[PDB]
Amino acid sequence: TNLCPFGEVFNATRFASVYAWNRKRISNCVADYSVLYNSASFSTFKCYGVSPTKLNDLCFTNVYADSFVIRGDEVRQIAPGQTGTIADYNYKLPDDFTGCVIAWNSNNLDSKVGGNYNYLYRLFRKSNLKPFERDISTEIYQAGSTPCNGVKGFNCYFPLQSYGFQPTYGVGYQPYRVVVLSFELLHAPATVCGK
Amino acid sequence: STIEEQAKTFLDKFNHEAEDLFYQSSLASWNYNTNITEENVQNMNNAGDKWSAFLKEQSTLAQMYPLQEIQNLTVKLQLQALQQNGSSVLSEDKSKRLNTILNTMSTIYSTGKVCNPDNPQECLLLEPGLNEIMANSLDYNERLWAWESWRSEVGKQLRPLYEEYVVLKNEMARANHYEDYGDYWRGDYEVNGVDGYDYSRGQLIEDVEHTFEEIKPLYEHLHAYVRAKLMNAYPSYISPIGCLPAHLLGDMWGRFWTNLYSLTVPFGQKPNIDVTDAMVDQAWDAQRIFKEAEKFFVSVGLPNMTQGFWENSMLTDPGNVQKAVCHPTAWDLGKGDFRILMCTKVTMDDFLTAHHEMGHIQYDMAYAAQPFLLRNGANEGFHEAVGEIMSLSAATPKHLKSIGLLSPDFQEDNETEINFLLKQALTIVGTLPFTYMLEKWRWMVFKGEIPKDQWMKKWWEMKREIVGVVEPVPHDETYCDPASLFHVSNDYSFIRYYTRTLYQFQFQEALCQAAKHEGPLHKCDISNSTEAGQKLFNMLRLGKSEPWTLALENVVGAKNMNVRPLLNYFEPLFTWLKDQNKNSFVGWSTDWSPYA
Ligand SMILES: *[C@@H]1O[C@H](CO)[C@@H](O)[C@H](O)[C@H]1NC(C)=O
Ligand SMILES: *[C@@H]1O[C@H](CO)[C@@H](O)[C@H](O)[C@H]1NC(C)=O
Ligand SMILES: *[C@@H]1O[C@H](CO)[C@@H](O)[C@H](O)[C@H]1NC(C)=O
Ligand SMILES: *[C@@H]1O[C@H](CO)[C@@H](O)[C@H](O)[C@H]1NC(C)=O
Ligand SMILES: *[C@@H]1O[C@H](CO)[C@@H](O)[C@H](O)[C@H]1NC(C)=O
C-alpha cells in the first residue's frame, strides 16, 4: 500500500501565491481522508457534491491538490459560482465543482512584523478566468487606450498586487492557507481508492 | 474605456496601494506614541514622509481625469477629495513660505515661556505652568499676570506671522476657486448634485447665525447667574451690568467655563456623583473599564471589540523607562486593525473617556467596509459628536446604578439635577458663544471685512458684544490674542465644535426616543436598546459615502442642524436660572472695562 503524499501539500514550508496557485496531482496511493476531517485543525472545510462524513470508500481516477494563500475575507470566494477578485482573476471553481475546500489561518507563519510581501494576487485582467485556469502573466495592464510599451504609466498598471501580511492585521486581512481537492472520475483506472 | 471607467480603475489601484501605505505610516506612529525614543521618531518620520509623498503623486494623477465627464457620484467623491490641491496650487516658493510660517507659529505656541518678574529663571510654559494658573487660581492678579503675559510675550511674536499667513492662505484658497480661506473651511459642509440634500458654503454661515440666535437666551441667563455668583466672590472687580473679565473664566481664553463650578455651584452641600471610590472598592483595573464599555455597545446590538483590539491597544501607562504620549486617542489603522491609546487610571473620568473613545472605534469599524477615501465621519463634527453621546448615557444615575457603581439607595433629587446641568452648561453652553465669535472673526478677516489696523479692535468689540467678555488690559494692534489659542495659531477650523455640540444632542434626543426613554432628556441611558443602536448604525456605516445632510437624517430624521434638542436637554436648568435671575440684571453693557 502507498500512502498519499498529503503531508507535503498541507505541511509545506511555503505556499504559492494565489495568482500562481500550486497543483499537485495525486495518484496510485491510499488516502485515509478521515484523518483530515477529524483533525480539529481547520477553520473552513466545506465539500461540494461528495460527502466528507465518512465517504473515504469511493474510488477516483486522479485527485488534484491545489494550494495557494489568500486573506481571510476572500475565503468565501473559493466556492462554485462566486464572484470576486480571487474567483475572477486568480482561482475560479466551476459551477458543477465536485471536491472540497480546506482552509486554515496561517498568521503565525506567513505574517511578519513589517509585512510579508511574498504572496501576491492578480488585481486586473481583461477577462474572467475559466474554471481551474492559471494566469502567471506580468504584462502591464492597459486601462486606457495608449499602449504601455511594457512600462508602468498613466492608465498603465502592473497587474499583480501584494498582500503585506503583518501579524497585527484584522482576521479579515490575515493569511489563510487553502487546499482545494478535486476528484476526477474519468472512464479510467480509478487508482485512488483512499480508505 | 471612458474617462469614468479609467477612473474606476485608477481608484482601484489607489485604494489597494494607499491602504498598505497608510497602515505603515499609522503603525510607525503607534510605536512612537507608545515608545518615545529617538529611533522611533525617525521611523515615524520616514514612514510619514513616504505616505505624504504617495498622496501628492496620486493627487496629480487624479487631476488628469476631469470630474465634468464623471456621473457615478460615489466615484466623483473619491476623485474630488483626492484632487484637492491644497497648498500645492501655490508656487514652490509661496508654499515653502507658508509651511515655514505654519511651523514657527506652532513652535512659538509650544515653546513659549513666560518668566516671573524678578526671576528670569523661574519660567513657565503654557502647559502646564500657565494652564495650572488659569484653571485653579482664585487670585485676581496672578490670573491677570498669566493672561496678559501669555498674550504679550507670545501673542505678539505671532502678529506679524499671522498677517502674512492670511495673505497666503487667501491666495491658496482663491487659486482653488474659493472666495477666501474662510470660505474654504466652510467647504467641509458642502453638498452638490443631490436633489433635496444640497447645502451651500454660505448656507453654513446663515445656519450658524440662525441657531445661535436661539441659544442667546439660555446663555444670557447663564451669563447673568455666573456674573452674580462671581460678583459675590470678587465684589470690587465685577460690574452688575458689565461684561465678564476674560482672565476669570476658568482657562486661558474662557473657552470652557468649567473651572468656575466651585464658585457658581447652586447647591454646594449635595456632593457630586463620583463613583471613583466604588471603583477602587471593587478592585477594578483598566481592562474592567473597557470591558464595561464593550458591554454597553453590545447592549444596543453593536459588535464587540476585535481580538486585535485587546491584544494591540495600550490601555495602561507603560510606566517605568518606556515613555508614552498619554493623550487619549482612537486609532483606525485600516486593514482590520483598531486600537486605543490611553494611560487609564481607576477613576470616573477615565471610565467616561473609555466610552467616548470606544465610540470613535465603533464609528471606524462601521464605515470600514467603505472605500478608503470615505472612511471618515460624515463631516468634521460627526466623529466628535458620536463620541460624546456615549459618555452621556454612561454617566446617568440610571446607568451607573445598573452596573453596580452607584448605590441603589441613591436617588436623583431636583437639586443635584440642577448641580449637574449647571456643570454641563458651564462646559457645553459657555463655549458656544466663544466658538461662534472666534470663527466669525476669522471668517471676516479672510473675507477682507477687517482691516489689519483694526484686528484687535474688532476682536474685543466682538468679545464684548457676542460672548459678553471684556479684556482686562487694553490691547493695541501689536497683539494677536486669537492666535494665543492653539487652534488659531495651528491652522485648525473651529466651527467644528459648534456644529458637533448641536449634532450630539440631536443624536442623543433621537436615540432616547428610540430607546423609549421617559423623563428629562439628560437622565437618558440608551443601554439595552437595540432599536436605538440600529438607528445610529444606519449612519455610522455611511462614513463619507453620503452627504452629511442625509447621514444626519438617518439618526434624527431632519436634514439640517437644529438647536432645539440642545435647549431641550437644558430646559430644567433654563427654568431654574430664570427664577434665580428675577432680581438680577440679564444682559451686559459692552462699554464697561475693568481698567476704567
Ligand atoms: C503535518 O505535521 C504534523 C506534525 O508532524 C503531523 O502530525 C501531521 O499528520 C501532518 N499533516 C498531514 C496531513 O500529514
Ligand atoms: C521601546 O524601545 C526601547 C529602545 O529605546 C526598548 O528598550 C523597549 O523595549 C521598547 N519597548 C517596547 C514595548 O518594545
Ligand atoms: C458606481 O460604481 C460602483 C463600482 O465602482 C458600482 O458598484 C455602483 O453600483 C455604481 N453606481 C452607479 C449608480 O452606477
Ligand atoms: C490644481 O492645480 C492645477 C495646477 O497644477 C490646476 O490645473 C487646477 O486648477 C487646480 N485645481 C483646483 C481645484 O484648484
Ligand atoms: C464576540 O462575539 C462573537 C460571537 O458573535 C464571539 O465569537 C467572540 O468570542 C466575541 N468576542 C468578544 C471579545 O466579545
Author numbering:
A (entry chain B): 333 to 527
B (entry chain A): 19 to 614
Task: Give passages from the manuscript.
S is a large type-1 transmembrane glycoprotein that assembles into homo-trimers (Walls et al., 2020), which decorate the outer surface of coronaviruses. S1 is responsible for target cell engagement, while S2 completes membrane fusion, allowing the viral RNA access to the host cell cytoplasm, where viral replication can begin. The RBD interacts with the cellular receptor angiotensin converting enzyme 2 (ACE2), which is expressed on diverse cell types, including cells in the upper and lower respiratory tracts, allowing SARS-CoV-2 to cause respiratory infection.
P.1 has three changes in the RBD (K417T, E484K, and N501Y), which are a particular cause for concern. We demonstrate an increased affinity of P.1 RBD for ACE2 and investigate the structural basis of this through crystallography. To better understand RBD-ACE2 interactions, we determined the crystal structure of the P.1 RBD-ACE2 complex at 3.1 Å resolution (STAR Methods). As expected, the mode of RBD-ACE2 engagement is essentially identical for P.1 and the original Wuhan RBD sequence. The root mean square deviation (RMSD) between the 791 Cα positions is 0.4 Å, similar to the experimental error in the coordinates, and the local structure around each of the three mutations is conserved. Residue 417 lies at the back of the RBD neck (our RBD anatomy follows Dejnirattisai et al., 2021) and in the original SARS-CoV-2 is a lysine residue that forms a salt bridge with D30 of ACE2. The threonine of P.1 RBD no longer forms this interaction, and the gap created is open to solvent, so there is no obvious reason why the mutation would increase affinity for ACE2; this is consistent with directed evolution studies (Zahradník et al., 2021), where this mutation was rarely selected in RBDs with increased affinity for ACE2. Residue 501 lies on the right shoulder of the RBD, and the change from a relatively short asparagine side chain to the large aromatic tyrosine allows for favorable ring stacking interactions consistent with increased affinity. In this paper, we demonstrate an increase in affinity of interaction for P.1 RBD with ACE2 to an equivalent degree as that observed for B.1.351, with binding somewhat tighter than for B.1.1.7.
